[PDB]
Amino acid sequence: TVHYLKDYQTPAYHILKTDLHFDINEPQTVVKSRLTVEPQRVGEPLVLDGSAKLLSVKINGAAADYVLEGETLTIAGVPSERFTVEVETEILPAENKSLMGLYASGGNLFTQCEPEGFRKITFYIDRPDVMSKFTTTIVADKKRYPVLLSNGNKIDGGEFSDGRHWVKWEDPFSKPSYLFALVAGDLAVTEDYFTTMSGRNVKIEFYTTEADKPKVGFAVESLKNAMKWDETRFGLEYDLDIFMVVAVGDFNMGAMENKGLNIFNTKFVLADSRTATDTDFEGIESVVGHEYFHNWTGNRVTCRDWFQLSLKEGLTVFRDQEFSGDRASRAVRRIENIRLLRQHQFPEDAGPTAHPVRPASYEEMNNFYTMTVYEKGAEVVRMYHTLLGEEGFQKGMKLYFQRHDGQAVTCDDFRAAMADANGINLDQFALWYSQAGTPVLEAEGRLKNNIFELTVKQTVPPTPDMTDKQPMMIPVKVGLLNRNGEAVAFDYQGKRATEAVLLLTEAEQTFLLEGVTEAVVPSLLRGFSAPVHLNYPYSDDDLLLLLAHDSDAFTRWEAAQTLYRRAVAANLATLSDGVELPKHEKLLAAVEKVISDDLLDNAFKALLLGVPSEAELWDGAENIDPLRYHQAREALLDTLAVHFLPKWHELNRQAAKQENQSYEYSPEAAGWRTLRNVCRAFVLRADPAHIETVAEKYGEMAQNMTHEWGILSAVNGNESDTRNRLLAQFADKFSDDALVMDKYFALVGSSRRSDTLQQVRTALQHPKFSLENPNKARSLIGSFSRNVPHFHAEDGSGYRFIADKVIEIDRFNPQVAARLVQAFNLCNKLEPHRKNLVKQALQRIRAQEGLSKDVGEIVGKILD
Template structure:
């Protein structure tokens, strides 16, 4: 697992980029990956892993370091939210599924299967918790001692924990559970004024059972909190017991299954801001009213907590839609949510990228993360109905905001106007968000888009945003624009990956046929991992087509898993994880998915990589 001197880059897409062929997100990814590999010269080379089980020692730590680098380069607020969104969409389902494993795995059949979101992204969250508990100065003291003790050595996650503890004179023995227990902890929190000048927070912690371990111990973790006045949204100062210092934010240390914390000198009706900065990788439940969430959305000084208030409102609205659809009732009007969206659209105290994030609705994979007996299409329809409502209600505002963002982008220096920079990238992100809502509200707007395409598509971020916005449109114009795009970039392999991803992620009725045709496209090769991921990976995340009631989507991906397994078991084992949801599905789809897994398992000469994943799901 040693990261020898140099930069080990495993994908050409993360080396070179230019604005004609790479999006702003691609540029940010190049910076992040190059930074990650560069940082490995210290965390992975100067100090490396004693054995494969310690893989997160270098990967979790180095992901944390590259995240902090990107945050310094771009924005701490938006980068943190992006990290959390990815963790929830990809790692939380892994932690709740049949392949769940601790940050430091206890065993493995095929080591390639442990280059996972848990080892990397959850591992980074564990490192971030050290930082939150110890502060920047304490964390740097720990890093300094870690290098002094272990430079030139191969060591363990325990050695890193010991360096952090010894450098700061603190006992972190119980923190070791983050390395040995799989699963995402759940915090159930209640808050109240106690009648004697204090505000009490009671926190119950549970760690759900996972296939490798049924009974879990309570974890040690930081819970960062603040309080806001329920009437005017002002942040409330308070004191910790035994202290005379007035503070507006504190970190509570959770160590037990249930604890009560008191914040003193609080007498007004307060709304707690919890898990600020996403201070621990957990599910958090608090009985907020919609009015309390509106206070946090408008007034919270922590960007993550502000964004999370909006996300909670979206999740509630989608759940209400789902209930109405299941019962055959009219969809709710969601007046409170619409008022919140109207506020976000008019907000002038946020930057463009953050405004776009506040308008983003949670993905299906996050919505069903903690559930069982899932009907994916019902969740999808409920989410689509909410997006349709927002698009129709605020069509004029989205048009106006798009024009505002376009004007702001035009104010940039002409020499770099369409080149990557965090400021101009934020305006383009907001424009693409608005475009998607405008095209959703008025599908016929595609005619105007087609007419002005060349004028609008000034760089790849614009092109990608436009094509993504029209990608689900049933009009023939959509096909014309995509084919025009493919012809323009037919000699650029990485841009063609974007074309194949668009084909496979479309909700159009003819998408399965278009995906089959793409398999025979001159620019497509199943033996190229980027191509396989762009087409097949995107299709496996396409909810209405992958989860089609006939089971055709499951059969198609199973066929490709078996085909790819003959020449690239690692890519096949990643693709087969699309079936991780199997045992949480409603009975009909569960049966269909199980049948495909059994068909894969019966394949002659199946690799260890795929066999391990399939075996765990079926078990």
């Protein structure tokens, strides 16, 4: 059964009011609903989605004539005017290991409804174009469940003689079912507030365990920053006098934007310097912002159907990116976002599971919360901003909300708003939503007369969903550098400037940059103006010049990235010919200049010193031996480590002094620590024995989690017993902090050491490990699945291990399993031996009785 976008049809029924009543007992919870249903197409049967135990169903107080089949409840004869439906269901939250619907965690109850989890609570028209006004009543034992939360305003509540108490929540904003939330349990609260631009106080309440409460401070501040920023940048104001955030340790995703009651994975809300890295802090800031920004881009305006997921996700990611960029280090953080895209989204677009930003079909919608919908989706939204500028973009946002506030709409509606608000045609831009695959740009430069003539051709490869690909609208931002590396002015188009956005709209175009009175090297795709591969015949010297002198952060970084890529390509060639490694003279020269350049921003310097991942390196390759690519990359890192060993120390000490004992989080101090941790990584592969010196003064250097993690990461591949000891001491010191134990299992799973597989298998039985906890499963098993030398081991042990865990995990959590099985996505691009073994593994997963729809869909894409 496949769902198709082209088959969309408006619902035959609307739900106007949704009154819910929760009776929480041990072990079961009884849900009583009362829906006010309004016919849209009179005469049609009422179809309700649902998978919970059905106890009773009524139409207007009378027992209904119905049939239950699969997860569908049908009532043939329903009135032609407004009527009530009353469904009574029973749930066993403690048995819910899928972490979808109503489930237990840490003795408390939580919900996760997006995309289609609400049907697991009650029978409902569970689709996002059906919006209803919710009133939620909750009854439970007061001692066990003192805190009872749902969307909106608490308007009533009371006590019963027998120890139970109740509450009543009213969400006045019509919403789809996927934004419903309920929380019941014993939780500590952190209180604060934000006053809106119109003088209205908004009560802020963060709910966590008693012990985790001290770690929620940074998240509260980030929210208040996010609330202020949305006002100042977008003119968007919060619309309730209460905003609640709940932390939960068992959670499939990062966080959830349920209206006025966000539910967060602990990893994106808890932090202190002692237990969280600077990266963790930045993560909290991004995600807290993200979930708050959904209140307008997702909740006030929602999705007509789930094919439109990127409408709220691409747009909201773009917003949290701009939020983070406005806070600090925009350039550095832009590179990070670009790096993430090329390292995870590009592989996806090149693989068997490739899909457009707006899919045309899906079997299981949970499989499409992907890098493509999110990150490429953001890049698509960012291109509007590039084409229109900030003011023009905000004009689109204004008209978007003017038209569609309180509606469930599509990506086309967003595009129309951008188009109409600025009086511009964006018909061709629609292809960014419908055409999958990474576009490839072939560029040629020619200076004849006094005009730099830039030819550019685009090509979009076929993908499993679509062969035909038409030319797309691709903004290419460009500049010119002379022999000395200073910006050269040119005329385009009737305007003399130092920078221009060349709009490529067809298969091949030539752009005329006139008024060029000297030799130039072009700077291309500045700021990563479009999500594409660009090929230009740069000399190594051209790259040295761009890296050294160009004014755009990305192009400088990309120039360094290109030199690294070429170096690894050389290593591959020599290792293949059974010959000495290359010398990499021009590369080593560049790295030396980077290391010694005191003018480079510390964090930007760290990025320039990062080598592209194996996935980037074998991009577009056939018959891949992942270990040869691994060997070639490792060889380059060894060369850089050993060659610059004393300067790594020097840079290390420089960073230590500039940090200046400022161990709490700040973008400034974090920049030095990032650079410090790069140096440690290089030092400790050049001189592994240095670990004992580090171990000797561990307590001295373990001044925050950034330092501990940085040190443990640097030594994680060390074959010394000291590596194991430090890991064991780490687990002991932080045994009580679940989020830090995640870091422990990540180190175990990711180690380059020869004995990683058996250490991983021992870790499975660690008292603090739980396969049923998504964070733990990802940390240990996810990391191993990405551990190239071990996952792609020749004997196939990595394949068999991961396949076993996919099978095992899928028995209780298909979402984690479906994510994990995508470690096999490289199947058909592997050399014959490994490909055979991967197919065997995939066949074995497929042969499982009761295999989830989630995993089945993915395995299908790879095998069939």
